[PDB]
Ligand binder design. Structure first.
Ligand SMILES: Cc1ccc(-c2[nH]nc3c2[C@@H](c2ccccc2)N(c2ccc(O)cc2)C3=O)cc1
Ligand SMILES: Nc1nc2c(ncn2[C@@H]2O[C@H](COP(=O)(O)OP(=O)(O)O)[C@@H](O)[C@H]2O)c(=O)[nH]1
Ligand SMILES: [Mg+2]
Lengths: 427, 67
């Protein structure tokens, strides 16, 4: 059950690279591709993400995409930069200028076919391809515009594989340009149609977690991406290690997505750790359970008490009592059962995996399909219309051939998605 | 969606071309109208200096006629 990973633009390749660092350390693969681990749980599911090369080396099934060479030379220089298959660096030279239209229609279209060539060569070496995971942001031009172009073309070539994304939402608190709300709205329009599962990673929440909880007065993308790679490691635990469940991307979609358009997940993580400084008291199972449901541990800046949980996945990591985990999970439901829709029975499912993440004895990853996520889309929608009602900054997009109409369509699809979430929060 | 994608990029091309074309024609129109104008103001200046010479003939012709 091979997964093909794609990472696109500056943000997508920065969090992409951290992901492969983190899980590589977990599977005991070193920066040259050689395995130097102790357990065999490490290698039982290694092929979900790694291709095996002659010499018994492990090479990520990862395609690195950008319209600029900058960040990708950074990856290739980074610690684990040499583990990536070099044919899988597909990049242009012009960049995308934080402009969704350039990534999706002009610059990106020039490059997309050679990206699809690498994707095809990766797929054809797969016994049973599950599908794809894309890391990208929605606020720039490459990961946003070209990333959603790739998804639209991958779905045309592989209509029956699962399409999974980690999508970083823009925020004025960690903002590169004023046009981020435009790019994000155009992208959400694509995501609603063409993905099965998207983890909404809100730069607004990562910032607030760094500032309030981690006591970092000046968060950097480094501080944010530490949180992102711990979440990405947590949510993919079930794919990468064996459980009582034989977990894959489609079973996840089947159990998490009751209506096709409502596939935007709130991730959460516990304990929240800042980079570098470790703390030496492992959490207790009661503490993991309480924090991972705490709004302060959510990676989408949405208040879960303002919505209802359609479904929930919880993945505990470490040596712990499965009896006590079952007990604490049953306790949080039965105590706050009003926040779980009553018309999906037993909509909370929990897994435990023996291997903890690096530097923690106990961790818990939360994946929520909450109607509270509409708060994120409302936020971006308000920022969009503030500019769009004055046509501000549109010339950057009409200059690439786009029409106002296409903005009106994307905004209106995103507002329907908001209304569709409110439908089921009252149900 | 593919046909829409090629329409958008055809439109960007068509707009860049139309902008280059119109700037090209605006300029040739200005440079031509400006040459006509400058030449007409000079030709009118010479025309009346050359009238000064016809009047200088007329005046020298009178000084012989009257003698
Ligand atoms: C309410 C609910 C939620 C999920 C499931 C279910 N059923 N099968 C699978 C799931 C999820 C899952 C969720 C939590 C614990 C273990 C499995 N999952 C998975 C796949 C890939 C991942 O990266 C992470 C999780 C499966 O493979 C059933 C009901
Ligand atoms: N969390 C996080 N967000 C990022 C990072 N780099 C960029 N972003 C976000 O992505 C947006 C910029 O888009 P970007 O992906 O850099 O443009 P691209 O090169 O065309 O893909 C900004 O709003 C940032 O908030 C990063 O390393 N971490
Ligand atoms: Mg940027």
């Amino acid at each position: 059950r091979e997964i093909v990973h794609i990472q696109a633009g500056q943000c997508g390749n920065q969090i992409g690279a951290k992901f492969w660092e983190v899980i590589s350390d977990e599977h005991g693969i070193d920066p040259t591709g050689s395995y130097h681990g102790d357990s065999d749980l490490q290698l039982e599911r290694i092929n979900v993400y790694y291709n095996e090369a002659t010499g018994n080396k492990y090479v990520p099934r990862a395609i690195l995409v950008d319209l600029e060479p900058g960040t990708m030379d950074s990856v290739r220089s980074g610690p684990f930069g040499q583990i990536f298959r070099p044919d899988n660096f597909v990049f242009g030279q012009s960049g995308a200028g934080n402009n969704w239209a350039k990534g999706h229609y002009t610059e990106g279209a020039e490059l997309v076919d050679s990206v699809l060539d690498v994707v095809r060569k990766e797929s054809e070496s797969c016994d049973c391809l599950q599908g794809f995971q894309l890391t990208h942001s929605l606020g720039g031009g490459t990961g946003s515009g070209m990333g959603t172009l790739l998804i639209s073309k991958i779905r045309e070539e592989y209509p029956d594989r699962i399409m999974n994304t980690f999508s970083v939402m823009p925020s004025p608190k960690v903002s590169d340009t004023v046009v981020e709300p435009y790019n994000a709205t155009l992208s959400v329009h694509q995501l609603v149609e063409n993905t099965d599962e998207t983890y909404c990673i809100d730069n607004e929440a990562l910032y607030d977690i760094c500032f309030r909880t981690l006591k970092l007065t000046t968060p950097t993308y480094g501080d944010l991406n530490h949180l992102v790679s711990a979440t990405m490691s947590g949510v993919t635990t079930c794919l990468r290690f064996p459980g009582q469940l034989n977990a894959d991307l489609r079973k996840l979609a089947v159990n998490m997505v009751p209506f096709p358009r409502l596939h935007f997940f709130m991730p959460g993580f516990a304990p929240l750790t800042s980079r570098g400084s470790q703390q030496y008291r492992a959490l207790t199972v009661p503490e993991l359970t309480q924090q991972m449901f705490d709004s302060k541990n959510m990676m989408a800046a949405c208040d879960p008490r303002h919505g209802r949980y359609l479904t929930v996945a919880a993945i505990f990591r470490g040596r712990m009592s499965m009896k006590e985990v079952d007990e604490q999970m049953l306790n949080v439901q039965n105590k706050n059962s009003s926040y779980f829709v009553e018309w999906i029975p037993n909509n909370v499912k929990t897994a435990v995996c023996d291997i903890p993440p690096r530097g923690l004895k106990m961790s818990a990853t939360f994946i929520g399909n909450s109607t509270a996520i509409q708060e994120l889309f409302k936020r971006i929608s308000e920022q969009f219309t503030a500019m769009f009602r004055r046509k501000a900054f549109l010339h950057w997009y009409t200059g690439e051939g786009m029409d106002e109409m296409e903005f009106t369509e994307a905004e209106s699809n995103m507002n329907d998605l908001v209304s569709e979430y409110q439908q089921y929060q009252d149900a | 969606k593919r046909e829409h994608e090629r329409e958008v990029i055809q439109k960007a091309i068509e707009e860049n071309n139309n902008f280059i074309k119109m700037a090209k024609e605006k300029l040739a129109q200005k440079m031509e109208s400006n040459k006509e104008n400058r030449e007409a103001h000079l030709a009118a200046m010479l025309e009346r200096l050359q009238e000064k010479d016809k009047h200088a003939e007329e005046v020298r012709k009178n000084k012989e006629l009257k003698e």
